[PDB]
Design an enzyme around this catalytic site. Structure first.
Site, PDB file in Angstrom:
ATOM      1  N   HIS A  99      15.606 -71.303  62.698  1.00  0.00           N
ATOM      2  CA  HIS A  99      15.579 -72.508  63.551  1.00  0.00           C
ATOM      3  C   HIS A  99      16.859 -72.815  64.318  1.00  0.00           C
ATOM      4  O   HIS A  99      17.508 -73.848  64.110  1.00  0.00           O
ATOM      5  CB  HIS A  99      15.072 -73.707  62.779  1.00  0.00           C
ATOM      6  N   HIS A 136      15.839 -69.513  69.128  1.00  0.00           N
ATOM      7  CA  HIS A 136      14.436 -69.914  69.017  1.00  0.00           C
ATOM      8  C   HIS A 136      14.063 -70.917  70.112  1.00  0.00           C
ATOM      9  O   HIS A 136      13.086 -70.712  70.828  1.00  0.00           O
ATOM     10  CB  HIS A 136      14.138 -70.495  67.626  1.00  0.00           C
ATOM     11  N   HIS A 193      13.060 -79.219  71.066  1.00  0.00           N
ATOM     12  CA  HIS A 193      12.026 -79.475  70.057  1.00  0.00           C
ATOM     13  C   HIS A 193      12.460 -79.268  68.592  1.00  0.00           C
ATOM     14  O   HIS A 193      11.858 -79.858  67.690  1.00  0.00           O
ATOM     15  CB  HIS A 193      10.749 -78.686  70.366  1.00  0.00           C
ATOM     16  N   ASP A 208       5.741 -72.253  70.564  1.00  0.00           N
ATOM     17  CA  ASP A 208       6.476 -72.287  69.298  1.00  0.00           C
ATOM     18  C   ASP A 208       6.198 -71.008  68.523  1.00  0.00           C
ATOM     19  O   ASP A 208       7.054 -70.518  67.791  1.00  0.00           O
ATOM     20  CB  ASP A 208       6.057 -73.524  68.470  1.00  0.00           C
TER      21      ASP A 208
HETATM   22 MG   LIG Z   1       9.989 -77.558  64.576  1.00  0.00          MG
HETATM   23 ZN   LIG Z   2      10.073 -74.476  66.775  1.00  0.00          ZN
END
Ligand SMILES: [Mg+2]
Ligand SMILES: [Zn+2]
Ligand SMILES: [Mg+2]
Ligand SMILES: [Zn+2]
EC number: 3.1.4.17
Lengths: 325, 338
Positions: free
Chosen positions: A66, A70, A106, A218
């Site tokens: 994360h 990403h 995000h 995502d």
């Molecule tokens: Mg997330």
């Molecule tokens: Zn994500």
């Protein structure tokens, strides 16, 4: 700076954005925004956009999965959907802008742990957000607002009152939709939209498509080649097993996928791809015929995982010619 | 020639000086350094009274022992330490099972000597490989079967026929013929195929009761004991069975790689891409090892512990099998292995 100068393949579904050096990702962000015309279209100030993107990048921590790379690769997929699926046929311009901006922000200040972990550990984030749910996603959105309100970072500060309010509501909804619990919650609605057919006159369909597209971005690492899916599984599981180690220490039973003693990666991965990823790119295919290759790459990557699973059983001897394990 | 000089002139070390547990079923002979093995052979020969009873010439016996040891090559399993450990178990059987109530002294002597020699000049490949690779050994013996075993026997005789090594040279013509016949049957009995062919007769023998006055019984008992010695690494602890597994599959997989370069498909147990070691070990324990030690127990009650150890080792493989599946990530945190 033109998109075509980065790489000739930049706007292809075949392109892997993680191959771009991290020091070049910020300008790639500006190039995509320019190539989508949002700079001239909404009269975004250039130095402000510049300072904003640097703040967003600086707002990501460094867990294995994360991280900014990403956020970067998620944003690039959003650009890919713009250029390959003709999104302007389905959504307003501000909605596309919002989706892209939201893709950047995000996972802001992600700590490498999921929502359940925040609540169990009684973190400050849980104290603030657990009662409304989607703990980390509420934090990400709040970090995004805190960035917007830093001196010289508000890219929306010249927008009209209505447009400013629209961007903010859109960003909230879109970042909230990145909780996979939300996606599963709305999956029936997404199917219903896909079966009746998309209605651009329907504001409800606009919100639903924005949720699916966000989710599609995502999970976009599943839509490349074998190498990308293999590498990303490495990063995700490292993050999962690190969480499980904290939970075990707290005297808590981690879920199977976060328990390195018990997790069987091939089954977890194939299940994730069969029951989460594939139905998502299946819905995208039903709505956008040009998204067919995305669904096909995912299923093909799925077959590669099955074909490789046998390597997780140790046959013959280990390489040291020893049974000391 | 100093190794021979010391073996001959320094005197035979008392067997109880080797280790305090030397005569126990729990003792693991592979823990004795290889440089100490020839003298330990002499010690065992002395403790069993063979040197005196048969008036074995000391210089001849020393040359013989060294020639036998030098008659082994060094593949991972079928080497001198295997032969040494098989001999030591023969010795354990003597000290613990009261063999002199079942067998003549010459048969017991033949058993022990046969044990030292039974795998001579092994090249790390099995009978099937000799034939498929068209080895010189198969050219000589394939028509009769038990190719490697015929070679081991032949090598034993060649050592005896070497001047200064014939430990039986003073025997009468009858006794000499008797020893060489015993060595032939005993060494040939180390072929698993032979063991499987006589298994029903072994079962019948143990069911009707051992008849010391039945010549066929003596022959069957010798085969069973020889097989028990050859498989004896399985009657020790877990660490022994584990290490022994590693040696055997190293040898097997090397054969498998050769068969592959010859364009043949190797036995699963020889194939390093297919072999699943815990299943193979468990199968070997269940089908081969356990029934052999169970027969031994049926004929000699004080052998009970041997069967119990093999059964226990089979349980341990079952308990350890889960570790052959990779849980979580490998230790380097990388899926590079694909
Ligand atoms: Mg997330
Ligand atoms: Zn994500
Ligand atoms: Mg043999
Ligand atoms: Zn042997």
């Amino acid at each position: 700076q033109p998109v075509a100068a980065i790489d000739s393949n930049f706007a292809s579904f075949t392109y892997t954005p993680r191959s771009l050096p991290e020091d070049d990702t910020s300008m790639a962000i500006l190039s995509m925004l320019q190539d989508m015309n949002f700079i001239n279209n909404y009269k975004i100030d250039c130095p402000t956009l510049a300072r904003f993107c640097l703040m967003v990048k600086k707002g990501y921590r460094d867990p294995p999965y994360h991280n900014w790379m990403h956020a970067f690769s998620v944003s690039h997929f959003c650009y890919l959907l713009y250029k390959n699926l003709e999104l302007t046929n389905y959504l307003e311009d501000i909605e596309i802008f919002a989706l892209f901006i939201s893709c950047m922000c995000h996972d802001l200040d992600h700590r490498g742990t999921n929502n359940s972990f925040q609540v169990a550990s009684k973190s400050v984030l849980a104290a603030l957000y657990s009662s409304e749910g989607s703990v980390m996603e509420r934090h990400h959105f709040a970090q995004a607002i805190a960035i917007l309100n830093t001196h010289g970072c508000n890219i929306f500060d010249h927008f009209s009152r209505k447009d400013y309010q629209r961007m903010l509501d859109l960003m909230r909804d879109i970042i909230l939709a990145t909780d996979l619990a939300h996606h599963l919650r709305i999956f029936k609605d997404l199917q219903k939209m896909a079966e009746v057919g998309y209605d651009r006159n329907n504001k409800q369909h606009h919100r639903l498509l924005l949720c699916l597209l966000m989710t599609s971005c995502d999970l976009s690492d599943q839509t490349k080649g074998w190498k990308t899916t293999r590498k990303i599984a490495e990063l995700i599981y490292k993050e999962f097993f690190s969480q499980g180690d904290l939970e075990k220490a707290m005297g808590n039973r981690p879920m199977e996928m976060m328990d390195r003693e018990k997790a069987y990666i091939p089954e977890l991965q194939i299940s994730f791809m069969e029951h989460i990823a594939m139905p998502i790119y299946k819905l995208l295919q039903d709505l956008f015929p040009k998204a067919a290759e995305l669904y096909e790459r995912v299923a093909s990557n799925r077959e590669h995982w099955t074909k490789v699973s046998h390597k997780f059983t140790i046959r013959g001897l280990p390489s040291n010619n020893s049974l000391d394990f």
